[PDB]
């Protein structure tokens, strides 16, 4: 096949690779930031649900 075949295929190879590599670097950075700050979807560790608590009046007041 003509040189244009291989060459046109290969810059597409390089573009896909680079658009994956900078994505990998940004993924490392995002994962670190979101493990440290935590203000986002993942790396959010569980907590206590607010539905378990009860607000109805109790036997003794001020509790």
């Amino acid at each position: 096949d003509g040189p244009e075949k291989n060459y046109e295929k290969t810059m597409a190879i390089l573009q896909i690779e680079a658009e994956k590599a900078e994505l990998r670097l940004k993924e490392l950075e995002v994962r670190r930031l979101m493990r440290a700050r935590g203000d986002g979807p993942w790396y959010q560790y569980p907590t206590i649900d607010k539905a378990l608590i009860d607000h109805s009046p109790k036997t003794t007041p001020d509790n």
């Binding site: 896909i16 658009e19 994956k20 994505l23 990998r24 993924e27 203000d39 986002g40 979807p41 959010q44």
Partner: peptide
């Protein structure tokens, strides 16, 4: 609260990567 997130799932870029 945590920053609310939304948006349809577009296919993962370049597969598993």
């Amino acid at each position: 609260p945590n920053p609310e997130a939304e948006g349809d799932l577009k296919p993962a870029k370049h597969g598993s990567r």
